[PDB]
Amino acid sequence: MFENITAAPADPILGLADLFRADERPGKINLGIGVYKDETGKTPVLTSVKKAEQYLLENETTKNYLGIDGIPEFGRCTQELLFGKGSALINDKRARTAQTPGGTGALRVAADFLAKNTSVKRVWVSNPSWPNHKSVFNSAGLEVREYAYYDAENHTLDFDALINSLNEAQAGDVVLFHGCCHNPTGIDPTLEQWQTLAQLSVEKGWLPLFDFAYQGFARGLEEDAEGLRAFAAMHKELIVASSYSKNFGLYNERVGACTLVAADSETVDRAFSQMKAAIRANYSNPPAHGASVVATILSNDALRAIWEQELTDMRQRIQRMRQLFVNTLQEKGANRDFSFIIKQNGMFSFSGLTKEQVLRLREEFGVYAVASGRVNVAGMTPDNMAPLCEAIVAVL
Amino acid sequence: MFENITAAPADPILGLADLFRADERPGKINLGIGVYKDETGKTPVLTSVKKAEQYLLENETTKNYLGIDGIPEFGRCTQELLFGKGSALINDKRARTAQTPGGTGALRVAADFLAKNTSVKRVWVSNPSWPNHKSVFNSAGLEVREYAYYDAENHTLDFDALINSLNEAQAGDVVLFHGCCHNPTGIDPTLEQWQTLAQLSVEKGWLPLFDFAYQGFARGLEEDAEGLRAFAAMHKELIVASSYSKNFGLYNERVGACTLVAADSETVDRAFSQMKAAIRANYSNPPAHGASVVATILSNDALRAIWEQELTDMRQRIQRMRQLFVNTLQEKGANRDFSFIIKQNGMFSFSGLTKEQVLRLREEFGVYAVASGRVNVAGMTPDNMAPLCEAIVAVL
Ligand SMILES: *Cc1c(COP(=O)(O)O)cnc(C)c1O
Numbered sequence: 001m002f003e004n005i006t007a008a009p010a011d012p013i014l015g016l017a018d019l020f021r022a023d024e025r026p027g028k029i030n031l032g033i034g035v036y037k038d039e040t041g042k043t044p045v046l047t048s049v050k051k052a053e054q055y056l057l058e059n060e061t062t063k064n065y066l067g068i069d070g071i072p073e074f075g076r077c078t079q080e081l082l083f084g085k086g087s088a089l090i091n092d093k094r095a096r097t098a099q100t101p102g103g104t105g106a107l108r109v110a111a112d113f114l115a116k117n118t119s120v121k122r123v124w125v126s127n128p129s130w131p132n133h134k135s136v137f138n139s140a141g142l143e144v145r146e147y148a149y150y151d152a153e154n155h156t157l158d159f160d161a162l163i164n165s166l167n168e169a170q171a172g173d174v175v176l177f178h179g180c181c182h183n184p185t186g187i188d189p190t191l192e193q194w195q196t197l198a199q200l201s202v203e204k205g206w207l208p209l210f211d212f213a214y215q216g217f218a219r220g221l222e223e224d225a226e227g228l229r230a231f232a233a234m235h236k237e238l239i240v241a242s243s244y245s246k247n248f249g250l251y252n253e254r255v256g257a258c259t260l261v262a263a264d265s266e267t268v269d270r271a272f273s274q275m276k277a278a279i280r281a282n283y284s285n286p287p288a289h290g291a292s293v294v295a296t297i298l299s300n301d302a303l304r305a306i307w308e309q310e311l312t313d314m315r316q317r318i319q320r321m322r323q324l325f326v327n328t329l330q331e332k333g334a335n336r337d338f339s340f341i342i343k344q345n346g347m348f349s350f351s352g353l354t355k356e357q358v359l360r361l362r363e364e365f366g367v368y369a370v371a372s373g374r375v376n377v378a379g380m381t382p383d384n385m386a387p388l389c390e391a392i393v394a395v396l
Numbered sequence: 397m398f399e400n401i402t403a404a405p406a407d408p409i410l411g412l413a414d415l416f417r418a419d420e421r422p423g424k425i426n427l428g429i430g431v432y433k434d435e436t437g438k439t440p441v442l443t444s445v446k447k448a449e450q451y452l453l454e455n456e457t458t459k460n461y462l463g464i465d466g467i468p469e470f471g472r473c474t475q476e477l478l479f480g481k482g483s484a485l486i487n488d489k490r491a492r493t494a495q496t497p498g499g500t501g502a503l504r505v506a507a508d509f510l511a512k513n514t515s516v517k518r519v520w521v522s523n524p525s526w527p528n529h530k531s532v533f534n535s536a537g538l539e540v541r542e543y544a545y546y547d548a549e550n551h552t553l554d555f556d557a558l559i560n561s562l563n564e565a566q567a568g569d570v571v572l573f574h575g576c577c578h579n580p581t582g583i584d585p586t587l588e589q590w591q592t593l594a595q596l597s598v599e600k601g602w603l604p605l606f607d608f609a610y611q612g613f614a615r616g617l618e619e620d621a622e623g624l625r626a627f628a629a630m631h632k633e634l635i636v637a638s639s640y641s642k643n644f645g646l647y648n649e650r651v652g653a654c655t656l657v658a659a660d661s662e663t664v665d666r667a668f669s670q671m672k673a674a675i676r677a678n679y680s681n682p683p684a685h686g687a688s689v690v691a692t693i694l695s696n697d698a699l700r701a702i703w704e705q706e707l708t709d710m711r712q713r714i715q716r717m718r719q720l721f722v723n724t725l726q727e728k729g730a731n732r733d734f735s736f737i738i739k740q741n742g743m744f745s746f747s748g749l750t751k752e753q754v755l756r757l758r759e760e761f762g763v764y765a766v767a768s769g770r771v772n773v774a775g776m777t778p779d780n781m782a783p784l785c786e787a788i789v790a791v792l
Pocket residue numbers: 034101102103104105130183211213242243244245246251255256680
């Protein structure tokens with residue numbers, strides 16, 4: 001059976017972790033996977049999640065199976081964060097959410113469901129986007145088309161190329177939007193551009209799918225959700241795949257959400273019964289620990305106040321490193337004016353590095369970055385800033 | 397998009413939990429989902445898992461992403477439990493295992509992988525089997541055929557019907573076997589019948605897929621794995637989907653394994669690179685808490701010794717209830733000699749109840765059982781044995 005199975009290529013993000021964790025150079029620098037590192041190069045487990053964990057340890061009676069859609073407290077809290085505390089989709093019982101294993105598990109559940117219960121055939125993803133988007137959707141059986149997104153010469157969103165790309169997307173197609181902190185570019189729509197995108201979706205019939213993985217990482221929690229809420233106020237139907245991996249520091253526990261909205265309580269509940277069928281045929285019900293840590297912090301006034309201090313401290317430190325990377329690059333010899341990376345938000349800088357500059361940087365200098373040139377700014381600390389800036393300019 | 401989506405039917409096992417948890421009768425009895433209940437009707441979180449959890453709470457530094465295949469300690473321990481501590485598949489680096497979200501997540505990963513990397517088109521499942529088997533495999537794109545398994549008049553395995561069924565299964569097809577504690581019947585092959593099945597797989601070219609969810613629930617840990625080990629010693633290639641939901645009491649944390657074996661180290665490693673690609677396109681990497689609780693208990697001599705006392709106490713109590721159900725049924729009026737259910741092992745009694753006796757029992761008596769007649773013996777306690785036996789005979 002298995003003798004003509006060729007080896008798969010390594011994943012572009014996760015394969016980096018494979019090779020880093022084998023590199024014996026004392027001074028290697030990771031810059032690759034999207035994990036926050038603190039001042040000391042550690043990705044600590046947050047204190048609000050460690051306090052919630054103490055809680056769960058004392059106050060937990062059973063490990064008995066969670067329902068297919070998981071914890072309803074979780075589902076409620078997530079809807080509040082996404083849509084507003086007191087929103088109309090909440091109040092009209094228009095949204096329904098299932099707890100999934102990460103934003104990836106959410107994005108697959110959406111795909112499986114759309115593939116089996118819907119007429120949709122195409123999903124439109126930004127050029128460039130998170131590399132694994134293509135792979136989740138082709139796995140569902142859907143095909144992925146790309147719409148122009150980022151103008152490299154000026155280092156901006158190219159809103160006209162993005163409009164004109166999508167004008168050959170049909171009514172009935174999915175168009176995946178990045179909630180905030182675009183991966184890889186870090187460039188997001190202005191709210192004024194999001195409401196333009198929102199009425200254009202409506203006039204043209206595209207179903208929106210929001211990948212929301214970095215909420216709290218751009219401006220703030222609520223501020224970050226404005227584009228989705230400009231779209232939610234106009235769309236009768238949309239699906240959002242939420243992740244709590246990043247903003248809660250809960251990467252290996254796999255906590256995310258798939259929230260489905262339809263025109264009314266009945267339609268959404270009918271559609272969610274097929275989402276639950278898709279979840280039962282994949283993994284049967286969701287992993288509880290991650291999600292109940294989220295539900296506990298979001299449900300306690302005090303433990304919540306500790307968490308969003310921790311989240312703003314993470315958002316600030318990266319802003320300080322972003323500053324630092326472009327200053328230190330200037331005095332270290334940089335051929336270019338990298339003053340555009342200060343403009344991008346979230347954990348990542350999309351520099352203009354070529355695939356060969358990136359490959360050279362891991363082979364002689366051992367600083368690991370993704371082949372598109374995406375470097376993780378959250379991975380930069382004041383101790384590694386100088387050796388790294390030096391590596392970049394020697395390859396430049 | 398969502399207006400012609402018909403509602404899905406409820407899941408046969410999980411839908412029961414939906415209706416039970418709504419029933420306002422004081423005296424309802426669950427008997428449906430395969431969760432162990434203790435003397436008091438509680439599904440407690442085990443003490444060895446609560447001690448391991450204390451551990452993880454004090455000794456955990458990060459929540460940073462686990463690799464696609466999860467924890468390697470876990471992978472090693474699982475292989476030892478399945479194959480023997482000192483086995484040849486271990487020693488020839490022939491087996492590779494990925495940590496999955498439950499046995500369901502394992503069974504899907506196997507299906508996705510076989511569907512995309514293999515020539516296999518058909519999967520053969522026992523008549524009757526776990527209802528969700530059909531649903532996982534059709535979701536992968538595979539079709540499911542049934543092979544005769546249980547002779548209802550005599551209450552046994554019908555080994556000739558099982559041989560003759562499978563003689564119209566091709567070389568290249570998957571034949572799913574239940575490791576031990578067949579769900580629903582509780583009837584397993586004799587080892588003498590498993591080595592017959594093992595050489596017949598070989599002469600005929602079927603790929604074995606073992607669903608192993610109740611290890612430790614029939615005779616004992618190692619004893620239970622003999623059939624799989626009769627098959628592993630002869631098969632160049634096989635896949636096993638392991639679950640630690642049942643024997644560890646870790647149902648909602650979703651810990652299971654997909655272990656792939658091929659003829660040699662190279663072939664298995666080439667094939668596992670595609671399994672990892674299938675995992676990355678589904679959920680990205682596995683949930684850590686459940687699996688590291690397993691790895692901690694299996695790795696500590698003391699915490700391990702506490703766990704297998706807890707597991708044998710669970711296995712004994714069900715044996716006591718099994719006795720009890722057939723005694724109490726006899727003195728409570730039973731029309732039949734239910735002395736066959738004492739012969740079946742694992743958590744479940746497959747009684748001859750019809751779908752209408754089962755439906756009547758939930759509607760007037762509120763005792764909830766699956767529509768095939770499968771009742772969960774682990775759900776029976778000395779306080780509910782008499783009202784339940786009385787309900788059954790009034791419907792008989
Ligand atoms: C990090 C990330 C994901 C993955 O989320 P998990 O919750 O870790 O599965 C998905 N999409 C984007 C855009 C991401 O940046």
